[PDB]
Amino acid sequence: SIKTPEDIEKMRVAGRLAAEVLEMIEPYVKPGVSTGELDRICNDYIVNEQHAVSACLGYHGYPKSVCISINEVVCHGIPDDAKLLKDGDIVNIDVTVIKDGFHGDTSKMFIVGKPTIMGERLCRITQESLYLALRMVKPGINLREIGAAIQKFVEAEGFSVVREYCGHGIGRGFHEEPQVLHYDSRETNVVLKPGMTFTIEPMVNAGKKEIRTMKDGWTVKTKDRSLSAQYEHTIVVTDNGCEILTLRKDDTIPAIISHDE
Numbered sequence: 001s002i003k004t005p006e007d008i009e010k011m012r013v014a015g016r017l018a019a020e021v022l023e024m025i026e027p028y029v030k031p032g033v034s035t036g037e038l039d040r041i042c043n044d045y046i047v048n049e050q051h052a053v054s055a056c057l058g059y060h061g062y063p064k065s066v067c068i069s070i071n072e073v074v075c076h077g078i079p080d081d082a083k084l085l086k087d088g089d090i091v092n093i094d095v096t097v098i099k100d101g102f103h104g105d106t107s108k109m110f111i112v113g114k115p116t117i118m119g120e121r122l123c124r125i126t127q128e129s130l131y132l133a134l135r136m137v138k139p140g141i142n143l144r145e146i147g148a149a150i151q152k153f154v155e156a157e158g159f160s161v162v163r164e165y166c167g168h169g170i171g172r173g174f175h176e177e178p179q180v181l182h183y184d185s186r187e188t189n190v191v192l193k194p195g196m197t198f199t200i201e202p203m204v205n206a207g208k209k210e211i212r213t214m215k216d217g218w219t220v221k222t223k224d225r226s227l228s229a230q231y232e233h234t235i236v237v238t239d240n241g242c243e244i245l246t247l248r249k250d251d252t253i254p255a256i257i258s259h260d261e
C-alpha cells in the first residue's frame with residue numbers, strides 16, 4: 001500500500017525506537033552474557049522506557065521479545081538463559097517495535113570478543129549488500145532488479161544468499177505486501193512507487209545457500225553449518241529515492257538517499 005505523510009511520520013518514530021534498542025543493547029553483547037538476558041534488557045527498555053511493545057512476542061506463538069541468532073543460525077533464534085556468548089561469535093539481534101500502531105523492524109550483527117577474519121568479512125559483505133540495495137531504491141526501480149543486484153554482489157564476493165526468507169512491506173502490519181526477495185526471481189515484478197514502506201534484510205551464508213529449520217519451528221540454520229549473517233533496515237520510498245527509518249549512529253550511510261542533482 002501507499003502510506004500517507006501521517007503514516008510515514010509514525011513509522012519514523014517506530015523505526016527510530018527500534019534502532020535505539022540496538023544502540024542501547026550494544027555494550028551488553030559481551031562474552032559470558034546469555035541471550036536470555038539480552039532479551040530481557042531489550043524488552044524492559046522497549047516497555048518501560050520507550051513505552052512501546054515488541055511485535056515479536058506472541059506472533060504466531062513466538063515466545064520472546066527479540067530474535068537473537070548466533071553463528072550458523074540464519075534467523076529467528078530464540079533467546080535462552082542457558083546460551084552464553086563466547087569469543088568469536090557473530091550475533092544478530094533482530095528488533096521489531098510497535099509504537100502508535102506502526103512497526104519498526106531492524107537488525108544488525110555484533111561480533112563477540114576477538115573477531116575471526118572470516119566472521120568480520122561475512123558481516124562486512126552482508127551489510128554492504130544491504131547498503132547497495134538501499135542506494136538503488138527509488139520510484140521506477142523493480143524489486144526484481146534490487147534482488148538481482150544483492151545476489152550478484154554477494155556471489156561475486158564468494159558468499160551465498162538465503163532464498164526462503166525475505167524482506168517485506170511493513171506498516172500497521174508486521175508483514176505486508178510486497179515480498180522483498182534478496183535474489184533474482186522470475187516471480188518478482190514490482191515497480192516501486194513513492195509512499196511504499198518495506199524492509200530489506202539479506203541473510204548471507206559463508207558456505208552454501210541451503211537452510212534447515214529446527215524442531216521449535218523458528219530456529220533456522222545453514223544446512224552445511226557455515227556462518228550466516230544478516231542486517232535489516234526499514235525504509236520508505238520517496239519521490240526520488242528512499243529514507244531509512246531505522247538508521248543508527250554506527251551506520252555509514254545517510255538516512256536520506258536522494259537521486260536528484
Ligand SMILES: CCCC[C@H](N)P(=O)(O)O
Pocket residue numbers: 055056057059062067075076094095096105165201232
Ligand atoms: C518473531 C518473528 C521475527 C520477525 C523478524 N523481525 P523478520 O520478519 O524480519 O524475519
Ligand SMILES: [Mn+2]
Pocket residue numbers: 094095096105106107201232
Ligand atoms: Mn526483523
Ligand SMILES: [Mn+2]
Pocket residue numbers: 105167168199201232
Ligand atoms: Mn523484517
Ligand code: NA
Pocket residue numbers: 069070071072073074075090092227228229
Ligand atoms: Na548467524
